[PDB]
Amino acid sequence: IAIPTNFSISVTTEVLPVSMTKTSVDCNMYICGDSTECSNLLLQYGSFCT
Amino acid sequence: VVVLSFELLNAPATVCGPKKSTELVKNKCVNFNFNGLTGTGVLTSSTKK
Ligand SMILES: *[C@@H]1O[C@H](CO)[C@@H](O)[C@H](O)[C@H]1NC(C)=O
Numbered sequence: 702i703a704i705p706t707n708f709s710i711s712v713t714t715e716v717l718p719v720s721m722t723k724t725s726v727d728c729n730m731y732i733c734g735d736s737t738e739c740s741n742l743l744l745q746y747g748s749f750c751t
Numbered sequence: 752v753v754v755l756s757f758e759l760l761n762a763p764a765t766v767c768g769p770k771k772s773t774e775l776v777k778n779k780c781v782n783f784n785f786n787g788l789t790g791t792g793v794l795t796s797s798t799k800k
Pocket residue numbers: 706707708
């Protein structure tokens with residue numbers, strides 16, 4: 702049999718993510734912008750952006 | 752028969768349409784038109800080259 706006669710104390714560092722960044726988007730100024738000619742056309746595509 | 756060929760680039764304009772120019776208005780959400788470049792926004796004095 703093998704039995705230790707001494708010992709050592711070690712400190713271990715481990716990392717793991719918890720959260721990401723929160724983001725938000727606006728369809729009416731991404732798809733069109735300030736163009737009111739295509740705001741009414743984007744209105745005809747339903748409720749994807751909701 | 753007369754065939755007309757058009758070219759629309761970033762070059763300065765030579766042949767251009769008849770429209771009545773107005774006065775420049777800054778710091779106001781307006782609709783602009785410069786060379787056939789209609790849009791919507793505010794106009795601010797620049798420092799770009
Ligand atoms: C155990 O290890 C420590 C660290 O190296 C040392 O100071 C100590 O003397 C050792 N014990 C024996 C009994 O040799």
